[PDB]
Structure formats: structure tokens, C-alpha cells
Design a protein around this ligand. Structure first.
Ligand SMILES: C[C@H](CCC(=O)NCCC[N+](C)(C)C[C@H](O)CS(=O)(=O)O)[C@H]1CC[C@H]2[C@@H]3[C@H](O)C[C@@H]4C[C@H](O)CC[C@]4(C)[C@H]3C[C@H](O)[C@]12C
Ligand SMILES: C[C@H](CCC(=O)NCCC[N+](C)(C)C[C@H](O)CS(=O)(=O)O)[C@H]1CC[C@H]2[C@@H]3[C@H](O)C[C@@H]4C[C@H](O)CC[C@]4(C)[C@H]3C[C@H](O)[C@]12C
Ligand SMILES: [Zn+2]
Lengths: 49, 49, 50, 555, 85
């Protein structure tokens, strides 16, 4: 399944129970298409490349 | 393409097995046709079938 | 292709027959290359670094 | 019945063992192939083991499948296999047992078998010399060949220099024409001279097949005409066998024994009236065949009958000899049992080779047929093991080179001690030092893509070979974006501009055009096209107009 | 392609010919020197379609406009390469 990942889970007590923590790097690797869409929307890159 | 013959690195090819089985069956069909053209004795054609 | 070809025409950029397939570091690691070793089948003129 | 007691114990106890089944089984079979079949049947039966160890706990615990309508058939197969007889399994053993009913010697009985073979070939040879279209075919081939539409050495495969053959062609031409130019005073003498001048020649087997096929077509014509006669008289008019053969025998040429037979005041004569024209046509084709050949249809039948009987005798001698020599074939084919091919495939190649050996044997050089056919068998099996063994097929000379390399590799790998290098093989062998690289690259098998790469959960090498030709979704999105960009750019031109710049390229159309068609469109196959194209190229080179395009530049 | 129930039944012979794209005849697969496919073995070009997308086997026709035309020299219907599947 594309758009997946994994890692070592951990503790993280500073959370309300409706939000799992998550790394910056797994996020920026799972949401590349979303990022690309938003970045061609805000004109921070005229083309997708 | 459901039974490929992928070119692996080094000239070595890594084929599926259905290529092998169909090669066997096509061999035996052609050989049976060849036996029939000659009209071999019945032990030959029987063992071929 | 099409309009890619129009691009080639507008800019004269010649797409070489050469294909980049270099060994680029696996993403995530940041080290110090400590040692390079080169091997050569004995029919190739050894390069400079070898 | 006791094996049925094994069945009921497997039902109750919930399993069995190798010791249990091996206890209850019917004695005296013990081939271990019937055993594996019966064990697979007991597995397919209610019992689902077959065991070794009795149990078994929470690890896959309390398993079962009903599988109704399979138990009643499986137990039936058991009770039937035990009670009747022990059935053979596989097909190599089928072939062994089925040929073991061959009396396995011809110690100089080969001479009688070759006698029968010569009988067949000589009776059919008398048929050859007697078949008129045979000599006409030879004369026609001679003319076609002399002009240069065919070769002399392609038609006939030597007598017992093509100019010798050609003067003999003219000799037999005169013989056949003098046979034909006496139409009944000396016809027998004529055929005698023709036969005795033609019965030391020979042809290609395929030319003889063409002769025999025109002969078979002649027979098919005569048989269809005898159908048109008898199936339209007897089976259409209640003209029984006796009352039809009373006039169908002996002369069998004139129309009288049908037409006048219509007038003999009989029921069949009172039923043949509408089949009169059809049987008239039948006897007319028969007499036209007469016109064709010169010999009565009864002589036609007698000649083809003698030919057929000689052919049957020869085929039967062939069969008898090959049945004998199957043992020889098996013995000689045992010696290649892992070349990359099956035992039965080897022995079938040997069957073909032994047949060719039979077809090309003569005692007139004093050979011993066993050792004679040994060569043909080994050669045919070698040709097969070369041609149709490797997965990707390599040619014969290439296989010879490969086995040369293997022989020399073994010799060097105990001469030099460690092993040889390609630079050393290119001087023990005398190859160009690069063909050896290509040879030892090519001559290896492929890996089985279901190979178990068991270094995982449970995987296969096939599950790890990625796809290379698929276009990245990044690439496809970029392509669509570039289409949109260049479309808006080209819209940012004039109608004539955009049209010429679409046409001279392959943009938004089929394959792209030439200046000939550009001119056939805009009236000017000339510098107007060049002007517009190059000037629009300059116009779109404008930064502030193609900046986005050049941002599409992957540099 | 919201088709229906799926359906299964025996494989009638003339049906098996309607599924066909030309009889396989020979046991070859590839050509041991140029790794194009020999015609016609388990593999092929004219039977099971082209190797490279929109490109003939011998190479006479190599443009998108020529899709559909079967090359007169090796009868390979120039079409996509997923038709090889
Ligand atoms: C038997 C073994 C299973 C794991 C134990 C499998 C796993 C990886 C396989 C090799 C790789 O494909 C690399 C290499 C490709 C060449 O081109 C052909 C040879 C090689 C040596 C292969 C042979 C064999 O198939 C290997 C060793
Ligand atoms: C490391 C891994 C085992 C882990 C335990 C081994 C076992 C089989 C190896 C593959 C084979 O070589 C075939 C193939 C050859 C290509 O050329 C390179 C890619 C492939 C997929 C290889 C990658 C890797 O090497 C594999 C997965
Ligand atoms: Zn072609």
C-alpha cells in the first residue's frame, strides 16, 4: 500500500487522546502529493519539478 | 507478461516456470505431429500421446 | 513527445543519449566517506583514481 | 476389506500414520507410486493427515473439513483398486511394460525382416514402373529441370553426373513413347522393356511421395466414381450386391451393364431410372480415366492393390524391427539423463532416429543393424538435446563451442591447479579473447522466478524484480502540466501562427507533417512556412513569454 | 466498467479461438543474441503485441499516428505494450 510507513512507537503523554504524534520526516514523505499541490497553489514553485 | 523472462543484470535471465511448462507442451505437440506424418508404429504414437 | 518537442525547438536543448545512473547516497545518512576501493576486469584501461 | 477397516479407523481416530496405512494396505503391490497415489486418495478422503506424528495441539487445533461427496468416491476408488487389480502409474513405466511384450531378439532374423521390406519396396516399384503418370511426371520434370526451373539432382537421388541421367531420361523417353505408340500388338513387350529400363533408377523420397500422392488421388477418383456407381444403384434402387456385381465385374468399362441392365425387367432396373444419368456420369468419368491412363479400371485396382499390399508388408516389417530395437534405444538413451531434458523425451527422439535408421539401412554392405542404428539414435538424441533443451535456444555450433570450453576448463582446472582465466582459455582454445567472454556469458540457464528467497516471511525472487518501463506519476503530472502550459502559450499567438506551429510539430494532432504538406495547406511550400516557423520561434523565445517553458527545463 | 455478476462455465473450443491472437507453434522464447522475441514461440510480437510502446518489431513504424497498422514485414500490430498483458 502506497502512502504508508512505520516506526518505533513511543510514549508521548502531552497529547489529547485524539492526536498521535508523528515525525516531521515521515510526514514530509507521506504527504508529498499534498505538498506539491499546495506549493503550486501558493505560487512558491511555478512548475511541479 | 504474466510469466515474464526479465533480463537480470549479467545476462542471466530470471524467468517464471510457465515458460518451461509451455515449452515442454509445445515440444511434445510438435513431436506428436511429426510422428503422425511418418506414421510410426503404434507403440511410438501411444507413448507420445 | 509533442509539446516537449516544441520546447526542444524553442530552446535547442539537445537531450543526450547519456543516462545518469550514478550511485547516490541512500537518503537519510550523513557520514564521512572513509575509504574507496576500485576493481577492474583486466581488459579495461585503469582510470586515474585507480 | 481390511483397507476399508483402515478407512473406518481414519474416520474414527481422526488421523492415521505411515505405519497404520502401511499395515492395512493390500500386499504384493509395493511399487511406492501406487502407494503415493493411494495416500493422496486417503488424504482426499475424510482422513486429512497423512501423519508421521500423532499430534498436534492448539497449534492449528481441532481442524476439519466435511467435504461431502468426496468421501463416497474416494472410498469407492480404494475398494475398486484393491479388489480388481493393481494399476500401473506414470508413463515411462507404461512404455517399459508395453514394450516388454516385444520378443527381444532378431539374431540374423533381421535378414528376413529386410526381406519383407524389400518385398514391399519392390512390389511398389513394379507399381512405379507400371503407373503411366509416373513416367510422364519424370519426363515433365526433366523438361522443367533442363530449362532451369528445377535441378536434375533435386528430382532423382542417383541411380544404382547429370548428363548420364539426362541421356537415360531420353532413353526412357523413347521407351515410354514406343510403349504408347502402338495403340495392342506388342503392349506387354513394351511394358516389359519399360519396366526393365526403369527398375534400376531412383528418386528423392519426396518425389516418390508426389508420385504416390497423384496415385492416391487417382484411387480417390476411382473410389468416388465407384461410389457414384454402386451407392447410387444398390443403395438407391434396391439393386443388391449380387445383381450389381453380376455386371460390375470383369469388363467394368462400358455403359451397357448399367443402361441395358435398366432394361432387364427387374425391380432395381425399375428404380435405377432417375439414377441413370448419375451412374452414366460415373461410368463416363471412369472411361475418361481410361482415356487418361490406358489400362482398365480393374487393372487399376489390381495394380494399386499390389502396391498397397507391398506397402503394408513394408510398414509391418518396419513396425516389427522397431518394436525389437526399442530396447536398444532405451539403453543408448539412458546416457543423457540430466542434459536438461526428460528420459521419455530422449527415448522418443531415439524412436524417431531408429525409424530413420530403419528407413536408411541395407544389408548389401554387411552391417550389423544393432550397431548401425546405434549411431543414428545417438545422433538424433544429440541433435535434440542441443536444439530443444536450453530455455533460450542456442544454435548447434554454439553448443559445440560450449562443450569444448567445458572440456578444456576441466583439463586446465587440474593442469594449472587452481583454475583457468579467459586469457588462458583464449590460448588453449584459440578464440579471439572476446568470443570467450560472450560464450561464457551466454551459455548459462535462467533462474526460476519462483525461486524461494527464504530470507523473509515467505517470499520469492519473482516478488522482488521491479518494473522499469512504468512512467513515474511525477512524470505524468509534469507532462500534463507542460501540455497545459504550452497550449496557453500557443493560444498566446495568432491563428495562423498557432496553426503552422502545431502542424510543423506533432502538437495536439497525429504524427507531424512536412513542409510539403505545410505548403499544401497555406498555399506556399516555400519560405512563407520558414518565415512563420522561425519568427514564431523567435517570438516565443521572449523571456516574459516563455519563462514558464524554460522553468519546465530539467537542467 | 460497473459490469455485473461474474460468470463461469466450460471453455468451449471456438471460444478459445476467439480469445486467441494467433497460434503459438514453436518452443523458442528469445533470440540469444538480440534479446527480441523469436517468432513465434511462447513469446512473440505478432501474436501477443509489441514489445516497446508504439514501436514495431523490425522498426518500420514508430509513431503514435501509425497505431493500428500491422507492419507488412513482421505483422506486429503497433499498439501499447500493456496489450502484451
Ligand atoms: C539461491 C539464492 C537464494 C537465497 C539462498 C538466490 C538468491 C540471490 C540469487 C542470485 C542473485 O539473483 C544475484 C545473481 C544474479 C546473476 O545474474 C545470477 C546469479 C546470482 C548469483 C543469483 C543465483 C541465486 O538464484 C541466488 C543466489
Ligand atoms: C539482500 C536480499 C536478501 C535479504 C536477506 C536479496 C535477496 C534477493 C536479492 C535480489 C536478487 O539479487 C535479484 C535482484 C537482482 C537485481 O540485480 C538487484 C535487485 C534484486 C531484487 C536483488 C535485491 C537484494 O539483493 C535481494 C532482495
Ligand atoms: Zn515490422
Amino acid at each position: 500500500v502506497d502512502y504508508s510507513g512505520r516506526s518505533v512507537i513511543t510514549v508521548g503523554p502531552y497529547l489529547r487522546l485524539h492526536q498521535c504524534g508523528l515525525p516531521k520526516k515521515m510526514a514530509l514523505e507521506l504527504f508529498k502529493p499534498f505538498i506539491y499541490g499546495k506549493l503550486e497553489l501558493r505560487g512558491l514553485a511555478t512548475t511541479i519539478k | 507478461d504474466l510469466r515474464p523472462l526479465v533480463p537480470l543484470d549479467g545476462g542471466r535471465f530470471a524467468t517464471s516456470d510457465l515458460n518451461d511448462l509451455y515449452r515442454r507442451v509445445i515440444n511434445r505437440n510438435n513431436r506428436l505431429k511429426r510422428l503422425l506424418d511418418l506414421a510410426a508404429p503404434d507403440i511410438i504414437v501411444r507413448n507420445e500421446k | 513527445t509533442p509539446e516537449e518537442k516544441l520546447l526542444r525547438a524553442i530552446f535547442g536543448e539537445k537531450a543526450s543519449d547519456v543516462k545518469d545512473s550514478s550511485l547516490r547516497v541512500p537518503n537519510g545518512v550523513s557520514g564521512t566517506v572513509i575509504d574507496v576501493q576500485v576493481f577492474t576486469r583486466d581488459g579495461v584501461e585503469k582510470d586515474k583514481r585507480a | 476389506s481390511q483397507l476399508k477397516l483402515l478407512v473406518t479407523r481414519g474416520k474414527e481416530q481422526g488421523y492415521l500414520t505411515y505405519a497404520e496405512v502401511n499395515d492395512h494396505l493390500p500386499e504384493d503391490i509395493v511399487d511406492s507410486d501406487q502407494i503415493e497415489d493411494i495416500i493422496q486418495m486417503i488424504n482426499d478422503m475424510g482422513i486429512q493427515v497423512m501423519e508421521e506424528a500423532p499430534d498436534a495441539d492448539d497449534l492449528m487445533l481441532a481442524e476439519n473439513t466435511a467435504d461431502e461427496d468426496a468421501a463416497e468416491a474416494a472410498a469407492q476408488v480404494l475398494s475398486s483398486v484393491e479388489s480388481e487389480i493393481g494399476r500401473t502409474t506414470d508413463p515411462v513405466r507404461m512404455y517399459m511394460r508395453e514394450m516388454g511384450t516385444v520378443e527381444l531378439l532378431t539374431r540374423e532374423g533381421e535378414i528376413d525382416i529386410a526381406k519383407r521390406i524389400e518385398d514391399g519396396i519392390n512390389q511398389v516399384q513394379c507399381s512405379v514402373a507400371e503407373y503411366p503418370e509416373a513416367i510422364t511426371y519424370l519426363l515433365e520434370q526433366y523438361d522443367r529441370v533442363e530449362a532451369e526451373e528445377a535441378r536434375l539432382s533435386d528430382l532423382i537421388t542417383g541411380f544404382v553426373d547429370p548428363e548420364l541421367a539426362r541421356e537415360k531420361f531420353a532413353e526412357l523417353r523413347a521407351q515410354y513413347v514406343v510403349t504408347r505408340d502402338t495403340i495392342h500388338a506388342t503392349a506387354q513387350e513394351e511394358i516389359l522393356k519399360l519396366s526393365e529400363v526403369f527398375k534400376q533408377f531412383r528418386l528423392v523420397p519426396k518425389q516418390f511421395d508426389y508420385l504416390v500422392n497423384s496415385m492416391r488421388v487417382m484411387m480417390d477418383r476411382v473410389r468416388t466414381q465407384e461410389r457414384l456407381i454402386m451407392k447410387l444403384c444398390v443403395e438407391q434402387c434396391k439393386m443388391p450386391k449380387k445383381n450389381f456385381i453380376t455386371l460390375f465385374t470383369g469388363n467394368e468399362t462400358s455403359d451397357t451393364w448399367f443402361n441395358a441392365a435398366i432394361a432387364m425387367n427387374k425391380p432395381w432396373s425399375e428404380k435405377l431410372h432417375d439414377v441413370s444419368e448419375e451412374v452414366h456420369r460415373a461410368l463416363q468419368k471412369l472411361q475418361q480415366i481410361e482415356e487418361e491412363t490406358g489400362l482398365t479400371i480393374e487393372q487399376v485396382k489390381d495394380i494399386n492393390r499390389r502396391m498397397s499390399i507391398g506397402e503394408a508388408k513394408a510398414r509391418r516389417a518396419k513396425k516389427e524391427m522397431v518394436e525389437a530395437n526399442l530396447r536398444l534405444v532405451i539403453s543408448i538413451a539412458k546416457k543423457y539423463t540430466n542434459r536438461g531434458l526428460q528420459f521419455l523425451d530422449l527415448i522418443q527422439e531415439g524412436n524417431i532416429g531408429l525409424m530413420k535408421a530403419v528407413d536408411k539401412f541395407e544389408y548389401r554392405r554387411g552391417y550389423k543393424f544393432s550397431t548401425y542404428a546405434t549411431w543414428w539414435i545417438r545422433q538424433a538424441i544429440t541433435r535434440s538435446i542441443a536444439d530443444q533443451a536450453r530455455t533460450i535456444r542456442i544454435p548447434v555450433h554454439m553448443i559445440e563451442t560450449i562443450n569444448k570450453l567445458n572440456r578444456i576448463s576441466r583439463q586446465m582446472l587440474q593442469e594449472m591447479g587452481r583454475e583457468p582465466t579467459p586469457e588462458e582459455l583464449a590460448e588453449r582454445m584459440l578464440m579471439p579473447e572476446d568470443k570467450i567472454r560472450k560464450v561464457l556469458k551466454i551459455a548459462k540457464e535462467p533462474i526460476s522466478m519462483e525461486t524461494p528467497i527464504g530470507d523473509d516471511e515467505d517470499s520469492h525472487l519473482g516478488d522482488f524484480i521491479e518494473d522499469t518501463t512504468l512512467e513515474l506519476p511525477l512524470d505524468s503530472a509534469t507532462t500534463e502540466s507542460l501540455r497545459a502550459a504550452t497550449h496557453d502559450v500557443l493560444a498566446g499567438l495568432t491563428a495562423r501562427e498557432a496553426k503552422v506551429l502545431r502542424m510543423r510539430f506533432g502538437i495536439d494532432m497525429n504524427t507531424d507533417y512536412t513542409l510539403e504538406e505545410v505548403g499544401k495547406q497555406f498555399d506556399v511550400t516555400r519560405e512563407r512556412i520558414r518565415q512563420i516557423e522561425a519568427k514564431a520561434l523567435r517570438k516565443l523565445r521572449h523571456p516574459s513569454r516563455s519563462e514558464v517553458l524554460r522553468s519546465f527545463l530539467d537542467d | 466498467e460497473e459490469f455485473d455478476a461474474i460468470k463461469i462455465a466450460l471453455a468451449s473450443p471456438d471460444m478459445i479461438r476467439s480469445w486467441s491472437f494467433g497460434e503459438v507453434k514453436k518452443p523458442e522464447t528469445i533470440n540469444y543474441r538480440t534479446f527480441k522475441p523469436e517468432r513465434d514461440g511462447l513469446f512473440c510480437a505478432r501474436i501477443f503485441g509489441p514489445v516497446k510502446d508504439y514501436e514495431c518489431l523490425c522498426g518500420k513504424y514508430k509513431r503514435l499516428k501509425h497505431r493500428g497498422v500491422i507492419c507488412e514485414k513482421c505483422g506486429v500490430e503497433v499498439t501499447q505494450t500493456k496489450v502484451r498483458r
